[PDB]
Design a protein around this ligand. Structure first.
Ligand SMILES: O=C(O)c1ccnc(C(=O)O)c1
Ligand SMILES: O=C(O)c1ccnc(C(=O)O)c1
Ligand SMILES: [Fe+2]
Ligand SMILES: [Fe+2]
Lengths: 342, 342
């Protein structure tokens, strides 16, 4: 009952029909409660953000000027700088960090990155659609200098007044980046966490977002810190291995479906699983990543979950450095705990 | 064949008989090779010490003046400062660190410490012997200022020329202390390691010493660093729990029996198990503990075993401090490795 997931699908204005329907959602093995959908003026929303809990804001106008963006408009105005585009023979686009590939030679990426011009991206899509292909593409490109003047106009129209005040109220560091995400229906980014505070602005299409608090670290089994898939869950949500990952049986999520105009606050360290609804067409999103606030005066107990995750990360990093080889980290940790702490 | 243990018992000079016999040795579940017994002039002994491997030196005259020490002589000359004396209803005298008891309230020492004057110690022994008691005593007291003039005379007679040169050649730090150990036949100090370099000078009676290199950390299962029995093996050598401690089945020792005049180099981090031969009478030993050498320029790979032990110790210490509670160390380490590194 309380695990109502994304809830009853919203009705679009002027009787244009249900935004989406249950059958566009993938099927998973865990329960989920709904993320609150609130007005930016609702003091409850300010409460959730201040407390680093997720909330969907329905009326920020954060990216009002971008709501007009489609492929046509963007190809026309975005410039001809390079755009990273990932390809995969599967619906899953597992993130990997290429700077860490050097030290796991045995890692072979499922998806491949290719730089290209926007028009080329648009062509590949049309090409795949008209030939019924099963290939999938996901453009994921940070918003840089080579963008056209109209796109820059839109950018300036963003609700900087609102977000700059959020940045200020939360003591967050600088805006590190804005990622532009354009994906095909059915695309999935497997569960992971980021060490950035994130306002995730939905623009075109609908995305189902499933989040897990940092205190579910134990149920989600991140890769080793030195692995390319650092911060990504090892668990295949489509075929969970309960032998390797027993506690995934205890995992409980928070979920919501976002559409044009919604902004989802994804607090730093919160796991998130993001998928573009089945048969919902392409999706477009722009995120806003901010460095988190500085670590307070000195430590205050009890520690929050995210501080414990930070401590584990640091242990793993320092051990890799001390041993002189990230590959020796596991054996040493085992030696340390077997028959001693387990 | 190569696992010949302490070897053929030595013959004492002038046909006074075998120093000791097999039946005075306790029975254990692992194999052992003999520690080399060499002359201080043997360049092989200098080799072993430089390489931090154990060696028994037969002719250092390190504590020549103390070879006359018996209870009578000591009670007469040692002063009347306080002497720590441990009592136990068992042959095992497990070392515990009282400064760490505060944070494991559930730990109850097997042996109890009582301060007393030397003559009182001598009395308790006589008392126990004449009444056939099963109680056991082990005096373990650092050699301080309150010692009489004759004992100080002996002390000055020690072979400082030889040992000071060892300290020098090995770059070791200062002499931290000299412990005086007086134990009843059959007494056992369960296996442990020390973060000091040790010349262990045998004076009266015979002790069987079993050492394990630092690279057997995995087979010996030390208590947690914050526990009172930090550095002690959890394994009961008399009834080994192969379920909890599977790798103790792989443990291999180096052993030797030392007598009046022998000095055993016990390199820093080497595990040692020390027992006073059954039915061999009281034993007397004086050790010489030196801070180890400083850590070289910077790290050189590959790391030695003892450097890995140091790294594990530091991880455990820093985690205790970060979490603000040593009790949370185990749960966090488990969370870190389960389904990730194991
Ligand atoms: O919308 C995406 O597919 C996505 C996936 C994972 N992470 C982010 C992010 O903005 O943190 C966005
Ligand atoms: O002779 C002892 O019982 C003993 C036991 C454990 N450690 C030492 C030492 O000198 O390191 C001495
Ligand atoms: Fe993310
Ligand atoms: Fe010791």
């Amino acid at each position: 009952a309380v695990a109502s997931g994304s809830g009853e699908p919203r009705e679009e204005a002027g009787a244009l029909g249900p935004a989406w329907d249950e059958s566009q959602l993938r099927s998973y093995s865990f329960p989920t409660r709904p993320i609150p959908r609130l007005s930016q003026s609702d003091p409850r929303a300010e409460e959730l953000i201040e407390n680093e809990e997720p909330v969907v804001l329905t009326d920020t106008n954060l990216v009002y000027p971008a709501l007009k963006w489609d492929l046509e408009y963007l190809q026309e105005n975005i410039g001809n700088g390079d755009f990273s585009v990932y390809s995969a023979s599967t619906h899953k686009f597992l993130y990997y960090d290429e700077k860490k590939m050097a030290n796991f030679q045995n890692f072979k990426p499922r998806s491949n990155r290719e730089e290209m011009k926007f028009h080329e991206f648009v062509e590949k899509l049309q090409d795949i659609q008209q030939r019924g292909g099963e290939e999938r593409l996901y453009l994921q490109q940070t918003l840089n200098d080579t963008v056209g003047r109209k796109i820059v106009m839109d950018f300036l129209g963003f609700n900087w007044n609102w977000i700059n005040k959020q940045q200020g109220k939360r003591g967050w560091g600088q805006l590190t980046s804005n990622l532009l995400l354009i994906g095909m229906e059915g695309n999935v980014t497997p569960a992971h966490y980021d060490e950035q505070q994130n306002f995730f602005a939905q623009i075109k299409g609908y995305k189902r977002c499933i989040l897990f608090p940092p205190d579910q670290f134990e149920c989600l089994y991140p890769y080793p810190v030195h692995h390319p898939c650092d911060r990504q869950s090892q668990v295949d949500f489509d075929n969970p291995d309960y032998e390797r990952f027993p506690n995934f049986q205890n995992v409980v999520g928070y979920e919501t479906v976002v559409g044009p105009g919604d902004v989802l606050y994804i607090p730093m360290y919160w796991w998130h699983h993001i998928e573009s609804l089945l048969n919902g067409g392409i999706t477009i999103t722009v995120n806003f990543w901010y460095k988190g606030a500085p670590t307070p005066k000195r430590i205050e107990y009890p520690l929050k979950a995210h501080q414990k995750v930070a401590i584990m990360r640091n242990i793993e990093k320092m051990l890799g450095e001390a041993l002189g080889n990230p590959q020796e980290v596991g054996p040493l940790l085992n030696t340390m705990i077997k028959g001693r702490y387990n």
